[PDB]
């Protein structure tokens, strides 16, 4: 259930910017990264008493 | 540019798992996170001498 | 009998310079071009009474 | 740089079909002709919207 | 020019019947055997004043 | 069963080099000759303790 | 630390009996199966107050 | 026949992790377990249409 990335555009980016192919399992791991980022965003909004996940709730300072 | 996440499923997961809405720019920064994961993947693959970004090249331990 | 081009290096050139794949039948047509160029080189050397095909005998002014 | 022709078979074809030797730089310019055919092939494929250099993209009618 | 054997089916036969791999140069030698067999078949038909190579013109009594 | 020769190129070589046609069963027996060469190749490789049928295992001196 | 299967003989068995290749990660999973079987054998001997793992302590009734 | 486990490391793991000795036929049945896992792996791969026994073909959930 639920693939959260747009496969064709991810592949195009990796081909265009990196001159590489993309494994199918790569798409799966990226989808799981999105899942984890949204779950943390929801916990970050709830800890602030808001009802909307905002860009500031998406934490990528470890990126 | 370029939306790399499936917006409808991101919103559906956030509403279904946290009851919240999803701001517009949340999609934007989720997409930026994908771009960065993909570009690190290309660097990981290049350092392995490979031409394919594989699951092993996408590290999401910090998320 | 006789493939006259170095397949792996032709493919690498097209991938590197053109960001493209190479069909197997492409290698065949390039080999036939080499065959035609050598046959004309031999006729060009013979018309000059020489026993050696030289660079000047390889005509690519139609290129 | 980069030799794109199979030198031993080029020499063997020239000796076997014309009884002649093959100068060193004959290989060099045969290789240059390959580079040019490949680069025109990439342009032909791009104008077709393709990502693969195919036999149809290598025109050797003038040779 | 001209590979006269069907590579994939030759490899399958050697793998299936002999439990072995097949070198690429093996395919070349088999193609040359076919070339020699057809050239002799043409000489055998011509010596009989026929215009068609037939099975009887393919001599493998030395096999 | 199994056609092991490239019929179109066999016919083209026979018409181009001898001006003749090629009967149907000529292909069949050419294919049988391939089967026999391959099976002798497997025996040659086995007697060398190898697992790969190589050019050295295909003897076509008698043809 | 510790590869518990004899790689070359496992590969030979799969090639001989199954006519197949063996992935390197296959050897790893088999080693882990051996590790799990010995750990259970030790618990089975201890539960009987013995100091020696015996064949009867190696349980493969789920096999 | 054929010992498929590394006896010295099996014994060392059993002595180091349980302080016990290892009977002779324990090695024998550990080896039989390997044979059976490999033969099920071949069946799993065949049902996938593959020619390689991979990690996915070795199921050790029941152990």
Author numbering:
A (entry chain H), B (entry chain D), C (entry chain H), D (entry chain D), E (entry chain H), F (entry chain D), ...: 2 to 64
Sentences reproduced from the published study:
Here we report that histones are major chromatin components in the bacteria Bdellovibrio bacteriovorus and Leptospira interrogans. Crystal structures (<2.0 Å) of the B. bacteriovorus histone (Bd0055) dimer and the histone–DNA complex confirm conserved histone-fold topology but indicate a distinct DNA-binding mode. Unlike known histones in eukaryotes, archaea and viruses, Bd0055 binds DNA end-on, forming a sheath of dimers encasing straight DNA rather than wrapping DNA around their outer surface. The bacterial histone Bd0055 from B. bacteriovorus HD100 is structurally similar to its archaeal and eukaryotic homologues but, rather than wrapping DNA around its outer surface, binds DNA edge-on and oligomerizes to form a dense nucleohistone fibre that completely encases DNA in vitro.
To understand how Bd0055 binds DNA, we solved the crystal structure of Bd0055 in complex with a 35 bp DNA fragment. This structure shows that Bd0055 contacts the DNA with only one L1-L2 binding interface across the minor groove. The molecular details of this edge-on interaction are very similar to those observed for other known histones. It employs the L1-L2 motif that is conserved across the domains of life, although the sprocket arginine that reaches into the minor groove in nearly all other histone–DNA complexes is missing. Surprisingly, rather than the DNA bending around the positively charged histone surface, the DNA maintains a straight trajectory. Additional histone dimers bind the next two phosphates through L1-L2 interfaces engaged in identical interactions but flipped by 180 degrees. The filament is stabilized through protein–protein interactions between histone dimers that involve the basic DNA-binding ridge and the acidic underside of histone dimers 1 and 5, and through exchanging N-terminal tails between dimers 1 and 4. This nucleohistone filament, which is characterized by a histone to DNA ratio of 1 histone dimer per 2.5 bp, reverses known histone convention by completely protecting straight DNA from the solvent. The crystal lattice we observed suggests the possibility that bacterial histones might generate higher-order fibre packing through the interaction of histones on adjacent nucleohistone filaments.
